[PDB]
Every structure is written in structure tokens, then in C-alpha cells.
Symmetry: D2
């Protein structure tokens, strides 16, 4: 099925009015919304409750404006990446199917979305091979759901997986199991990293790694993974976004890599991959309304430098480098797109090269 993609701003933490307005104006249909991926204005760490508030707001609009039951609505994968430091604007990217009578099928590659949920992820699985294999299997399922057989047509895989809590850790130990760590913040970075290796395994980017590789072998990464985590579910939510020929629709996705926090060229590369023809040295004013959004990861390098210059991110006990780097890359990124509503996420283990991250772009080409 062909996909409509719409990026809407959130006017406040519990606002889903722009989604409601798209529905009223006939831009998309509530019951055809199949995935939502957004940025929320919480702290972007462990105790970020803005992700819960947005979820309820969006689900209430979907239930109210459609014939779907609140149970069906609850199955819709909605992934919120918290923390909008600096200029980053809270927003949600909405993915919906399009009725056939609204589309002109084309052999040109156009956007497709696949979804899947993994098998249950036990606490003792988190960060270990069991998480990797269960994720890999669900990524293959989502890939098929998207109608994609070739991994090269996958450009962006957004996930949400569980973190470790006092309670789940207690559960692991009650059944004679161990856990990779007991620190909740660490368990997040771990859960993301293990999920990312699963993605890279599923897509043939890497051979199956060992337990020992997880968080250590930073040469091993997915070039399309975007992993987040939270306390909501005990399994992996997968959303695969790629292209398929013969489906029709207006939008196409592309990706590249950001080698470091300042790599605007890598963002331009993603937009070019997505199907825009741009000048050698593009500027935001060249986009002509055609860029829907970009989705990327970023991180502070372990060597404490960017382009041979020392920075103090890693030792900063006042403001965690997660927030510093997020705001920095938010600006770098919004300077390319000209739109502060950009999807910039942190916690990037095994997601792009060390000090960098994958970057995906969705563009509006027409039929």
C-alpha cells in the first residue's frame, strides 16, 4: 500500500490538534494511520514523562475520528524520542496508507512502511544475543510487511525496546538469571545498542555478533538503525521505512551517514539519496518545500574531540553530554533543513560509526 507522510507540530505537550486537522481536511484518514514517530519536549533521559502524555493525546484523536476501537488504536506503533534541546521543535511524523483510488502506481521507488513486534524480551535478554536474535527476526517480519525483499531498500528502522528496572531486575534474579547492568540509564543505551545489532544482523550489514561485542565493538553498526527505549513494553516495536517499486505515492526515503556532529554534507547526502537533485553546495533555500523530515542519531566521541579539537562533553557532570550533543546537532541539522522540526536522537551505540550516526531523509517527489 502507498503511504502518505505528514509532519505536524505539537503546540504543547498534550496537543494532537494538527493530526485532528489533517483528518478533518481529508489529508489522511484516522483508521489508515499505521505509525507515528515524534519528538517530545521532556528531558530526553530516564525520567521523561512527556512521551506518555503525547501518546495519550494522539491515540485519543485516532479513536475519536475513526471507526477503530481503542484496542485497535492501541496496537498502532507510536515512538516518541524525548528531548528537544535548543531549537528542536516538538512534532510528530504521521505515516498513513492511502486508498487505491487516490494513487497512481509507478515503477519508481516510493515510500513503504512495515511494522512488527518481537517476541517477549526478558530482562536477562537485554543487551545479549537473545535480544539480538529476537530483534533480527522481527526486523525481517517488518521488512516483509513493508513489501521489501532487498535490504538495500531499507533506509530507516525505528525501534522501541524495554529498559531494565528494579522490578524486572528482581524478576531476572528470582529465576536465577543475571542482567547486563543494574543502572537504568545504562540499560537504555544497552537496549538501544543490542537492538541496533539485531537490525544490522537482519539487514546483512554485519555477521552475528557475540555477547562480548555489545557496547564494545563500535566498528559494528547498522547504517539505518534508530533505537529508543522505555518502560512501556516488554518486547521490541519495529517500524521499517524504505522504498518499493510499483506501489505509487508521493514520497521517497533515502539515507546516508553523519561522520561527526558537524557533518552537514552527510545530511545533504541523505536528501540526495532520497531523490532530490540539488546543487553541489546546497542550502536550505534549495529544498522548495520538498523535505518532509530528517531522522538521525548523534553522539559525543569517546576520544573527546571533534575534527582535532578537544571538547569537555564527556566529563560534564552539570549537563549530561546527551543534552549538549542533542542541542548542537539540532542546530547543525535545522540549519540544513531550515525547519527546526527535525528528528534528532541520542544513545547511538552500534547506530552509525563512533561519534556519528545514521541520517535518513523523506522527501516529497510527486507521482
Amino acid at each position: 500500500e502507498a503511504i502518505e507522510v505528514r509532519k505536524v507540530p505539537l503546540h504543547s505537550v498534550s496537543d494532537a490538534s494538527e493530526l485532528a486537522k489533517l483528518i478533518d481536511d481529508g489529508v489522511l484518514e484516522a483508521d489508515r494511520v499505521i505509525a507515528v514517530i515524534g519528538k517530545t519536549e521532556g528531558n530526553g533521559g530516564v525520567n521523561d514523562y512527556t512521551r506518555i502524555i503525547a501518546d495519550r493525546a494522539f491515540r485519543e484523536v485516532l479513536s475519536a475520528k475513526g471507526n477503530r476501537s481503542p484496542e485497535e488504536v492501541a496496537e498502532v506503533p507510536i515512538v516518541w524520542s524525548g528531548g528537544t534541546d535548543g531549537v528542536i521543535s516538538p512534532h510528530a511524523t504521521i505515516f498513513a496508507t492511502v486508498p487505491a483510488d487516490k494513487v497512481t502506481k509507478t515503477d519508481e521507488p516510493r515510500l513503504t512502511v512495515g511494522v512488527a513486534m518481537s517476541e517477549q524480551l526478558l530482562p536477562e535478554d537485554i543487551g545479549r544475543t537473545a535480544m539480538i536474535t529476537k530483534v533480527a527476526a522481527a526486523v525481517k517480519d517488518a521488512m516483509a510487511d513493508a513489501g521489501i525483499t532487498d535490504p538495500a531498500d531499507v533506509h530507516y528502522v525505528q525501534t522501541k525496546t524495554p529498559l531494565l528496572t528494579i522490578h524486572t531486575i528482581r524478576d531476572a534474579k528470582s529465576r536465577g538469571k543475571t542482567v547486563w547492568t543494574e543502572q537504568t540509564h545504562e540499560s537504555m543505551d544497552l537496549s538501544n545498542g543490542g537492538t541496533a545489532l539485531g537490525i544490522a544482523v537482519a539487514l546483512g550489514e554485519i555477521d552475528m555478533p557475540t555477547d562480548e561485542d555489545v557496547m564494545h565493538s563500535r566498528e559494528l553498526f547498522s547504517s539505518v538503525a534508530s533505537c529508543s527505549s522505555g518502560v512501556e513494553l516488554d518486547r521490541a516495536q519495529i517500524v521499517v521505512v524504505g522504498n518499493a517499486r510499483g506501489v505509487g505515492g508521493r514520497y521517497r526515503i533515502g539515507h546516508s551517514v553523519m561522520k561527526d556532529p558537524l557533518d552537514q554534507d552527510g545530511i545533504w547526502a541523505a536528501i540526495r539519496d532520497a531523490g532530490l537533485e540539488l546543487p553541489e553546495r546546497p542550502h536550505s533555500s534549495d529544498l522548495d518545500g520538498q523535505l518532509v523530515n530528517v531522522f538521525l542519531k548523534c553522539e559525543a566521541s569517546q576520544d573527546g574531540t571533534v575534527r582535532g579539537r578537544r571538547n569537555a562533553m564527556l566529563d560534564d557532570s552539570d549537563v549530561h553530554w546527551h543534552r549538549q550533543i542533542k542541542s548542537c546537532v539540532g542546530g547543525v541539522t535545522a540549519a540544513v533543513t531550515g525547519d527546526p522540526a527535525v528528528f534528532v536522537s541520542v544513545s547511538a551505540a552500534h547506530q552509525g560509526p563512533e561519534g556519528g550516526g545514521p541520517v535518513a531523509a523523506i522527501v516529497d517527489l510527486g507521482q
Copy 2:
């Protein structure tokens, strides 16, 4: 009227002045000819940032050790440390020194000139009021004459460092039966920079002498060259006027423009072009070819809580003050233009450039 040598050096640690000492040993410049230092330090950028005083002592001790100047003479050298290097911003110092005429090529081309002055003491009473404004305008007058400049249009950058209010100085004001504009120490930073900036704008004929009521409230009143920073390392306004003069010689030239908002990379390019560095249209950092010494700019979160029509949550964020968010964001924006994370980005820009933006100055090496 004397030619200037300008060198940007990294700080390897909080108390490191080794690269200054090395410049002196290699004959690049003479200790007694150092007339001003402007740098970035890795502290929190707020009130209780002691990284500014540590760098100050480190640099002054090098200057007094390697020269014939007395620690008293050395103490009158304006050294401005803008704390806070959120994100990629690399701790560094820009050193300005005079050069004997025998080492320069005189030219009718405009080349860099620097004037320095220390205002009268600024009491806590004065901060943010007409007393700060008139004392500053006076020291700016002095500095302009010291640079050999009579026309304000040749001024491209006025960097100041003034006191903010601390518990101790607020205790002082009240012990003498005086009053202070605010007792929120972190608020007092914004006020100190703002009052100083109006003093600069008064001295350069950019605005008519304002009233107490105008300070922080009349944001339409601003200097287009003022870069005012504040901290706890001298109870006087350290003033550094930087412009160009014809017939003096030297390798360096300064230019400026304005950043209309945090994402306005074109405004930074404009400054570099204004400084006389001939660049292609559609420039990229790879065009600089080692020729940009540094940029110096201000940034701020707009009072309307938006950038380019997109809401952000900076002004409501009680976790990480918007000073630090915007500083990291614009650090990245800026370093993406220069390709060098050692950039002078300072926050809190009341009456310094238009609201939501700031002035940006560039020093280039033209030979």
C-alpha cells in the same frame, strides 16, 4: 598607530597557557606586546564558573614571567573569558599583540587595529542602570581612541566583560544602603551584558542615551557590534575595540554581519566575506584554506519562543537553562561553517543585535 598579530590557541586543560608560552618562545609574538586576550573556557558559563578565573591567572602568569611587564601592568591587560563550551565548542584563547613596524608590510588596505580600556569600577548598584551605561560609553570612547579610530563605522567588534551580581556583591550594595536591579544572580548576567551593550551603542552613536526603563525592555535598541559577556573576574568593564585602519599593515582584517536567528549560517558567511576573505558563492568550510582565525558572536533564545515559526521549549526549561541549550546549538551551527570547533560563541544578547539573533564578527588572515 600599530599593526596587530592575532593567534588563536587551544587550551589543553583549565589551567593551560602553554600554547601562549610557545608562541613567545618561537618568536611569533612578544609577551609585553600582548594587549588583549579573548577566549572560551570549559566551565558552566553561569555565575559559579571558576574556570574563567583559573585561565586568567594562568595567562597573566605567563605574560608576567616571559616579559618585563610587572604583574601590575599585566593586570591591566583586558582578558575576557566567556565560560561555557557546551557541545563541540573547544576551549581556546584569541591573543592580540602589537607588532613592530619593521615586521609588517604597510598597506593602504584596511588591516586590524585594537583599542583597549578598563572602565571605572562598576558597583553592584550600577549594574543594569544608567551608571553602567555612561561609565561603559566612556571606556568605549577611550578604547576607540586607543585603536586610532575616529569613525565608528570602522569598529566591527567590541568585546566586553563586566561583573554580574553575586550574593557577596548584593550583600555589599545593601550594607551601604543601596539597591540592585535584581537579586537573581543568574538573571544579573543577562542584565550586565545588556547595560554594557547600550553603553557601547551610545558610545558609537548607534542609539540615543536610553533610560533605566529601557534596559532589558526595549530590545529594538541595540548595538550591531557589541559582544558583552559577564562573570566574576573583574569589577570593571574590560573593553576591547576591534576594527580596521588603512596604512598600518599587518596580515589580519576584521569584518562583521548579523545572525538573524540561531540557524543563520549565511550571516556568519557574510561576516567572513565582510572581513575581506574572497570566497565562492555557496561557500563551504573547505573553502577557508586556513584563513579564518576565528569568529565571535552572540546568540539567544527569542522571547517569542519560536525559530522560523517553530515552537521550542527553551524558555520553560527548568532543567537545563536556555543559555546552555542555545549556546550548544549555535556552537554547532557556527562550527559547521568554520569547520573548527574553536569558535567564540557567547550567550545572552540583550541590546546586542536584533532580538533572537546577535552580531557576528570574523577575523581573517589575508597576508
Copy 3:
């Protein structure tokens, strides 16, 4: 005039109202008889604390589900959530409900009574000025009558929750050509609490009607029972007057005293004794024997930057706002008296108790 049941319950998570639901199911109290809730939530305690709105929705949904009251009637129940549980402070809610006379033992002994009132809307314009003061004094009047109290001396605790200024409401004020006392959102919290407190002190005859100029500046003007908190969950002053009346019956009684500074455990003991709980001289937490329901108090960092002649660095700390430092400190001081980390400790106490201290109220179970 009606007897009160008071129950303090833990919050197990941010959206947990299960212990309220359990009280209702076990017949401890009736949903429709809940007249006020006062609690602590685990958010940051500042402007962008959304844990208050999450708890609000959770509690109101229990009240509307288990009772015959309409969600509209339920919405008029004053629920005050003081965010920020730094240190040991345990998220919890104190529930106040009426009790049918058939379930109480009438007594000429003083026993708890509660009055409630919601003020008129508070515009952003009004916050911190006489308009807030006179609107509050009026709603406090209403609440006192609702509690069946004519003598202000029988009032021991007036808890309020008022709006603070946010970007959005500041945008509103200006869109209508109005002005605001400040635009520093986090500053506006201190102001909101202070203006409300003067309204309480005016209503209870503690002070003469003050001027705009007195707000935040005349700290000698205060209420000895006011506990004013502020946030973003209603644009009206939720007022809860708590005192004692003779001849009503019930198990609980309230008392109050004052904490002269953050370390004044004796002032907290004094409140408990005032409430009618007979304790040994030289009391210890082990003397309470289950009989202290909760304490409710304010704290603040003194303007002089000292406690008992010792300097602290709270007011100069740009990393962790003194709100959070003092809240954690007094949380521990307080919980060391009660032996129960579930204590109502709120920060920012302008015109609420003497400068550097705050009122403290205690509710005890006497049977």
C-alpha cells in the same frame, strides 16, 4: 459543618491512583466525599514539570469512575500537586474527605475541618500584583466560610496552587496589549507563590492590603499559615483552608508552627505538639507511634546566603537551582523528624513565614 477523614497514600508511579481506588473499595472513604487532595509528585518541581498534570488526571479519573459525581463536578475538587521530590521525599497524596456524622464521635475537642474554593481566573497580567492579591483574598474568604470558620486563629494551613508564567501565557498577555511582572518563567514561580501568600495574609487579617511595590520586596510581610505552590495545571487559585472546629468530631486535628530556618527540627516538633499529639520532651520519630498523618511546610534559601552564620553557595549555583537544593535538604531535615519520607515539603516561600524559613503544619490522628 462536617467531619473529615484524612489519608496519606503513596504514589507507586507517576500515573498511579491505585491507593485512592483501594481506600474507596475498602469503605475507608467515599469517592464523592473527597473534597481536596494535596500531594507531592516526582517531576522537577519547576516550570516544565508534567508529573503534576499526570497525577491530576489519574486522581480525577478515579474520582469520576467510582462516584456519581460528573467529570465536571470532579474538576472543581482542588487538587494541589507540589512537584519535586528531591532526595528522600516520597511521592504521595494526602486525601481529605467528608465523613457522615453517623460514623464519627462528636466531641467538644477541636477536630479537623476543611474549606475549599477556586478563585477567579488569574490572567498572566495579574500574577504578582494586587489583582492576584484581591482575587486570592476573596477565594480564601470563601474557603474559610466553607470550613465553618469565622475566627482566623482557627486556621492552621492554607494550601494553594496557582499558575506561574509560561512562554504561552506571556505570549497571551502581550497579544492583548498587557504586561507581565517578569518573563523569566522560573522566576514567576516565586512570584506567584508570593502574591498568593499576601492574599492569604490579607484575608486572615495578618497584614494590611499591600502595594504592587511590596510584592517580593517586603519580606517582613507574611502569612504564618500560607503554603503556596505554583505550576501549570490550572489558571485559577485552588484554595484549601484547613483548621479545627469544636463539636464536629472526627479523628484528626491540625496544628502549626514556624521553621525559623532550614535546620529547625524543633519548629516541626512544635507543629506536631500544637496539633494535639502529646509527646515527650526531647521527642524522637519513634515517639509518633503511627499518629502523624503528614507535615506540610515551606522552605527557602535566605537572601543573605547564610544559615546560622555559615555561608552556603545556593544562590550563586547556576548548575542546580537552589529550589532543588533546599528542597532536598529540608526533605531530609523533615523526614528525620517524622521518620517517614512521605512529607509535604514545598519550596519558594516569599511572604510565607519569616525570611529563610516557612510555616509548618501537622495533622495528627488522635481518635
Copy 4:
């Protein structure tokens, strides 16, 4: 030799004037100062530069007012624990020897101090048995230096050991070694924990642990250890404080344990152990000038609770629990002593039981 102990406030970050004044008034002699242990007003994390500034200030007073050379002065162990959240007042406890003609020797136990430096601590030693054994050996050396053979007369062991940095980690790997972790904040907690096990080994509190025990076996701890760490030295600084009979002097030290953050009784226990006779339920007003200082550790329990009440310290990404717990326990502690100048330190692995910490008290008894 007999010891004089004096606690002085720091009026500012670079103030050592009260030390200078003690010397001028003849209270102690500069050249007889043998150790300094204090609290500084920095953030108490990794990037805390207030410890450097205080060091220089104190050493300059010692060099100026005595005949010791700046090299001899540099050998004086000075240990700064950063972070003074809440009411905690910056201060330094000064330990000096007393000339014989100033003392009356007594068989009563009185205060003694021993110092020692360990063998070099390589990065690969940190957190492992090599650190444990090298520390144990230096603790035995310091114990002998104090004139103590019985470990039961040791009440407080304050240390300073190295953390892991990018550079030292690079060194370890260049020589084919590994490190326990590469995170600097973690390396601090590790360095403290390993040092603490070394102390407990030296004093016979525990049998020699394994690598696997470090940071994991929290049942293993020293009841007198107080460990800090920083980038200054590559070996362990040890300061043993205990009692010896037959030496004379006015002061005596005692200790106990704080079982949890609210355990004022444990602090009272230490003061009683130190030789004060106090009421069953003591109050700060009973101390009658006799308490010099208390020295303790605190921490947030891994179970997320205090006395059966949940708190949100561990998940708080806005304000690290180190700062929360420090401020909370600062208040608890200052409420017992009545003096906000208290030595409260965090990072307490293997230093007291889990959720608690050792507490030591020095009291003034006379001859």
C-alpha cells in the same frame, strides 16, 4: 605528637584567610600543619575545579607564614571533597602538631594523625587487587605514622586516589593492559571503592577480596573509610585519624555508622564514641561548643527506597542523585551539629553499609 584541630570557613572559593588568622593569633603554627581536609563549593562531580583553587590558596598561606619551602608545603596532604549542596558550608579542617611545651601528656585517648602515600597506581590497577594491596600497605604505613598499632583506634581514613582519563586509558592500552571502565565518573566511584576495600583489608575489617567483588559485593565495606578521587596524583594519599594514649592534646575522635540517609542516631553515636556524655535524645544545643566536625558518607540505596518509601533519586536524569543525597544528608547532619560546616561526601562504595556510610566525629575534651 599531640594534635590541634581547627575547622575554618572558606569565605569564597580562593579564601584561606581564616587559616592565616589562626597562625597570626598563635593558635597553630604554619610549619606544624600536617594535613587539611575540606569541603569546596564546586559541583562535586568530575569537572569540579574548586578543589584546585582552594589548594593553591591554602598552600600559599602555608608557604608565606612559615619557614617551609614551597616544595615542602607541596607534600602536605590536602584533600578537598567538592559539592556543598544545600546548607553545607565550605570549610577546611586543619590538623597541626603541637609543641611539647604546650601539652600535658595523659593516658586518656587523644587524637593522632598519620599520613602516607602509596606506590604508584597504574590505570590498570584502578578498581582491582593491585590497587587494594597497594592501598592496604600505605594505610598500614599511615597507621604506624599515627602511633597506632590497634586498628580499633582508627576512626577515620580519608584518601585521595586517581581516576581514569582518556590519556591514562590510552597508556594502559599502549602497554597491553585493560582498564575496569573507560567512563570517568564511573572510574571515580571505582577508585573510591577499591581504595575503601584496601582500607578495610589493612584494618582487618575484611579478608582480601577478589577483582569480582569490587563494586559488586556491597556486604564488604570499611566502617571508617572516606575515599575521594581526582586527576592530581598517580598514587593514593592516605590520612589516618585515630586516638593514642600517652600523647596528650585536647581532641578525641570517635565513629559509628549511618544506616540510611535519615539516621541522625548514628551521628549521635559517633559523637558519643568520641567521648561526649549526652542525653538519651540529644539536641544540637547540648554540644556546648564541643564538636569540631563530623565526617561522613551517604548514598542512595539500590533498592530505590528509604524506610519503605520509594524515592526517584536513581532515575533522575536532571539532577544526579549524588547532589540530591548530598543536600538531604547535609541537612540531616547539620540539624544534629547545629553547624552547617559539616564534611558530607558521596561516592560510598564499600564505605559503610549499602544506603548508608561511616560517620566520624572529632570533639574537644580538654587535657
